[PDB]
Design a protein around this ligand. Structure first.
Ligand SMILES: NC(=O)c1ccc[n+]([C@@H]2O[C@H](COP(=O)([O-])OP(=O)(O)OC[C@H]3O[C@@H](n4cnc5c(N)ncnc54)[C@H](O)[C@@H]3O)[C@@H](O)[C@H]2O)c1
Ligand SMILES: NC(=O)c1ccc[n+]([C@@H]2O[C@H](COP(=O)([O-])OP(=O)(O)OC[C@H]3O[C@@H](n4cnc5c(N)ncnc54)[C@H](O)[C@@H]3O)[C@@H](O)[C@H]2O)c1
Ligand SMILES: NC(=O)c1ccc[n+]([C@@H]2O[C@H](COP(=O)([O-])OP(=O)(O)OC[C@H]3O[C@@H](n4cnc5c(N)ncnc54)[C@H](O)[C@@H]3O)[C@@H](O)[C@H]2O)c1
Ligand SMILES: NC(=O)c1ccc[n+]([C@@H]2O[C@H](COP(=O)([O-])OP(=O)(O)OC[C@H]3O[C@@H](n4cnc5c(N)ncnc54)[C@H](O)[C@@H]3O)[C@@H](O)[C@H]2O)c1
Lengths: 331, 331, 331, 331
């Protein structure tokens, strides 16, 4: 005579198992900005939230659940134990120490590598066949780290990389040209950093190379100072940090973007961190942003951008800087 | 000739006037939740952000702008000034103090009225025809204050109210019954706070009244404790505040749902805060949530819900509770 | 070296297996409406189209494929064969004869059963675990046929039923009351046809029962003729058939709503066709619409709606009406 | 004592006036494919349908209304008199004679020009400040026609033009390259026809010019026959017509695309028909596809694509052919 029993006549029972489960490791500024964006885009049927902060974790879980009416993701779960993560199609890693005002993203390495040595083995134990998407900084070094510990194939380990950088770039060009960013094409390659390479030779609006119309555009001295657009891209992260303390909405939106190409298998081209040994005459084990076709299996192919010798100059530059650091690890 | 003049041939200038402009006043946890939710629902063609904290403001703006590629709201602007808010269809006010742990929303009244005394005349002046959506707590009292200061007809001054408490109610009912919140119907009327009323006479799943199946349901001391679901609703804000410090995701979702009915002129019914003088024997000018039909002109109608004598009793004590605080008229 | 080999560096092959694959059987007016609605809701990652008319089929496929840039379903395929339908989560059957002007849906039974006798075993063989969504008329009887032929548990054989009649009901109620269909609640149970039942005991706006306010509502010969709203529901198919020849947009929308609850495992309640033996004194194996809770496994539960003696009477005569045609067992 | 009056307490009344109204002239294959696509994308709050076929018109109106529950466009109206069209932000023209198997789209001119002389003056009388979007064939000639009769500024008269052609192109390249169409960039310029110009010099994946890697690509004799991709683009319309009788879904989706850039004012670049006198050394009053930045005011700017002398050769070719026809009109 329970209310439920007078009202509902049961046929079937509690299968469980989700088809499109997404996990978000770390429920901080970035982790919740990723979660909100991924929920609004309706990509998962089950989202799993993991943090070591128990109170915060349960608190953000509840705030998202409270919003159930308005969502189309009926199972929202969280925990400290990784069992909650089981059979995730995608695992977004956002956990770690973030930059303090004026901090070099390369200073976070000690602290974040200790976090990864801990969580990678726990996430791979429960989801042996997931696509890892690393957001934590320094993202290029940390993607290598996940790869190295997890033992996964180079296709299932992605670093958010220069998706955000190129998104800032398009936005900045778009404001100069008076065209929506969607319509200005421009790649920010290499390190998700201070040593990122603007590929000037590829910047265009509706198939027209801005470099043929303006050969002065790019890595020099004279102009309408297009070169300062690349500079505001390198600086934008710092200025936002100085103004609000951290960055979050642009990264959350750029994660939902990659998350959509993985979940729907669209095979779209995105500048993301991948293993580049055997490609720009880079002979080491580095991870850096290159245009990659992203799908349900992760990175299935890399696009061999036609780089000028100056641009290929800065890519072995960005790439060496980066490996300098990496051998000091080795664990 | 600029690179701009070489690439693009101009055909017009013109007055870029916004058609679906939304203003968010206060760029805090609640304001940005509102903002992101409204941007992902693609309700606005221009969003304006106003805050007194100049840096925070610029910061949130740039973070949002860098995500431009991923949104469909081409213009995002901000200022301390209010000239930026001109010709807004709707303005969402989230400015002010929030609860500290264990604090009643009624306790913020004096500080928030002090801020509304400044903001309302600057809003009313630049968007003579906007709809005001009041989020700041205690929401019922600030909605009356907003009304009073503004000089606006009642139809155009809306408190976010029990939209959110109703969502939380439906979620909790949902859990117990094994059905999505969307198929569980139930209303939380009165104060958006401790004195809210569960309308158990009306809780249904597919037209069937749970109070008809289980006459002991709710405001009954008997057997399966449905009454504890209302206590959880009441307590839910306090409980997320104790765990993460503030609530934000649920209300940003609830506001974008409201925002949707208003911008698209949907004529949906939402439990929101409005002037209930005349209805339910209410002789005082108090604001509280009652089911309202929401459209391009704000509140066009109020639904006369048929309250059991015990639910009417409880609604009255709720407006009695709000008027007690309301005789303070510090404006 | 191809231009392909020069542009792109490959990292993998792999088995492109679909995760959210939808099959639409029959590429007519109803099948393409279903198809477009399901593609715009971005429910599938692969859609397969099967029809016997080879040319029409190729045609609809190419039209759809040319719109690829505007959709997020990367793979669209078709064939006469059924090998193309493998590992589908859901299959929407819209194949068969439709009504000529003035024709009862019960009249198509013999022709459509002849087609189901061929299609069902070819479906059941290649997607052992799909959910069957039956659209072909008379929908109630073909759902039973589909069930019977298939060997599938009842939970996985769904008729589109009164989902659509309920939508039409809510629309009409909507008009009269001045509120969006979304805020008007009401159910059309029984046969998806002339014998359907309006459940006036349950029609509400915000929890308030219209039958409580106006006791003469509906299955009453008295004053404002709410009963004429049900007559319009019954008649609506006949009337659009006389004016444009067939109905298509409403049912494609109604099917994509259903499709949504199933793919995302929403657990929403929809009036759909299922086996009602045991409920409401129904001693025969007939299919008809009753409020059902819909999820990744199909029908997991049936809601026991509390019918007035006159509504129970009318539901019985509706299953009595369907069983009369049902003793024909030509399969 | 009406039901409505016991239930609803009125505050406000029937304002009317819509903010985002869209009109669709012609409710045939294309007109309803435009309407469905525009409704699913939620761009209008009011849609107006106009046709001379009264029965068909009312029948499609009803089928769309029946689907109200599932939509977010609460006013759906139709008529034979243009008063229904009043104060439309956008008017989509789809009315006219369509191609029979093997018919040259230039043969429809007599029949469609008689239709336009009739409807243009009626649509401009009710919406003096609308953006006209012409879809009817031959679209280039007919856009000129609307321009000429309406007396509108060249910015508010757009022809759907080569949006569809370039959408087919990307789709075809995308299948060769194994990349989503979204990611392969390629412009089909000129006549929405048989004399359309593929701009090979602008085709790229992630900023890399396929022509620098493969100089043989394009307008010649040797290869991997990329030139046949342009040919299937020219032929695709005919083959779809031969297979299903007409084309509709790809055009409907491409109209919703432009409709979104106009309604939301995104300022996106699209290949659409516009007045090109004073641009490729074309000295006449022709309309042909060029990359244009599209917004709330229509075409605000044109992008001066860098064309090879061969490509500029075929653009004055396409453009002359086209004006040959046009002087025979003059009305
Ligand atoms: N790649 C990009 O473009 C990008 C952009 C912005 C920020 N980031 C990075 O994201 C990271 C997080 O920044 P943020 O603002 O959200 O930080 P935050 O302080 O707000 O949150 C970090 C979260 O990590 C958690 N954490 C620590 N150890 C953990 C463990 N074992 N498991 C789970 N969680 C653990 C914390 O408890 C905290 O909740 C930083 O490394 C930052 O640089 C990357
Ligand atoms: N109604 C609801 O259901 C509900 C739900 C949650 C929170 N809230 C209320 O939301 C309000 C905002 O909450 P919060 O977390 O975002 O606070 P917060 O401190 O994060 O941000 C409040 C913001 O208000 C701005 N502000 C203050 N005075 C201002 C003024 N005169 N002009 C402009 N901006 C001004 C601040 O500078 C700050 O950025 C609080 O009153 C809170 O209680 C209501
Ligand atoms: N349940 C509802 O509410 C509802 C609503 C509308 C229409 N319908 C029903 O939808 C069905 C389809 O309607 P319609 O307008 O699209 O018809 P239609 O003639 O437009 O298309 C029917 C299609 O079925 C295909 N077909 C027939 N036999 C086949 C077989 N063995 N295998 C494969 N395909 C086969 C045809 O070749 C044709 O393309 C009819 O039975 C109609 O009554 C039901
Ligand atoms: N530009 C493109 O890429 C493109 C692509 C496909 C089709 N088209 C064109 O669209 C047009 C329509 O094709 P379709 O399949 O929908 O045709 P259809 O036969 O299905 O419909 C044409 C509609 O026009 C109507 N009509 C005739 N005179 C009218 C008047 N004064 N006012 C209103 N409506 C009137 C008809 O009654 C009919 O309903 C054709 O000219 C065709 O070439 C353009």
């Amino acid at each position: 005579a329970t209310l439920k029993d007078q009202l509902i006549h049961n046929l079937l029972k509690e299968e469980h198992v989700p088809h499109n489960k997404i996990t978000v490791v770390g429920v901080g500024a970035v982790g919740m900005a990723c979660a909100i964006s991924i929920l609004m885009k309706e990509l998962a049927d089950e989202i799993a939230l993991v943090d070591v902060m128990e109170d915060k974790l349960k608190g953000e879980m509840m705030d998202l659940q409270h919003g159930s009416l308005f969502l189309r993701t009926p199972k929202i779960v969280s925990g400290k134990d990784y069992n909650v993560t089981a059979n995730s199609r995608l695992v977004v890693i956002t956990a770690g120490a973030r930059q303090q005002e004026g901090e070099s993203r390369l200073n976070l390495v000690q602290r974040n590598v200790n976090i990864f040595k801990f969580i990678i083995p726990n996430i791979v134990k429960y989801s042996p066949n997931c696509k890892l998407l690393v957001v934590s900084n320094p993202v290029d070094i940390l993607t290598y780290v996940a790869w190295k510990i997890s033992g996964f194939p180079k296709n299932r380990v992605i670093g958010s990389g220069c998706n955000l950088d190129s998104a800032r770039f398009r936005y900045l060009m778009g404001e100069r040209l008076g065209v929506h960013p969607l319509s200005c094409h421009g790649w920010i390659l290499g390190e998700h950093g201070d040593s990122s390479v603007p590929v000037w030779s590829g910047v265009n609006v509706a198939g027209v190379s801005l470099k043929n119309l303006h050969p002065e555009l790019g890595t020099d001295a004279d102009k309408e100072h297009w070169k300062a657009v690349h500079k505001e891209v390198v600086d934008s992260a710092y200025e936002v940090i100085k103004l609000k303390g951290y960055t979050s909405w642009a990264i959350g939106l750029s994660v939902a973007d990659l998350a959509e190409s993985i979940m729907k298998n669209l095979r779209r081209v995105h500048p993301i961190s991948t293993m580049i040994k055997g490609l720009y005459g880079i002979k080491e084990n580095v991870f850096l942003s290159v245009p990659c076709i992203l799908g349900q299996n992760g990175i299935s192919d890399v696009v061999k951008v036609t780089l000028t010798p100056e641009e290929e100059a800065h890519l072995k530059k960005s790439a060496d800087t980066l490996w300098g650091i990496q051998k000091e690890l080795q664990f």
